């Protein structure tokens, strides 16, 4: 399983 | 699984 | 199973 | 099970 | 499992 | 089961 | 199951 | 199990 | 299990 | 279990 999520602000 | 999530601002 | 979300403003 | 969204505004 | 998350202000 | 919703304001 | 959601104001 | 949310003011 | 959320003002 | 929040002001 590959859990990924990333944020650019 | 392959789980993506990724947010531009 | 592929799961893919991507948001841009 | 290819699941897929994306938003660009 | 592969667990990432990173937040770029 | 994939759930989405976003809101742009 | 995969759960989203995100809130651009 | 992928649990999402994020907001942006 | 993966739980994320994030908040930018 | 990965739990993750972040705020930024």
Same mark, same amino acid.
């Given at each position: 399983?590959? *859990? *990924?999520? *990333? *944020?650019?602000?």
């Amino acid at each position: 399983q590959y *859990n *990924n999520q *990333n *944020n650019f602000v």
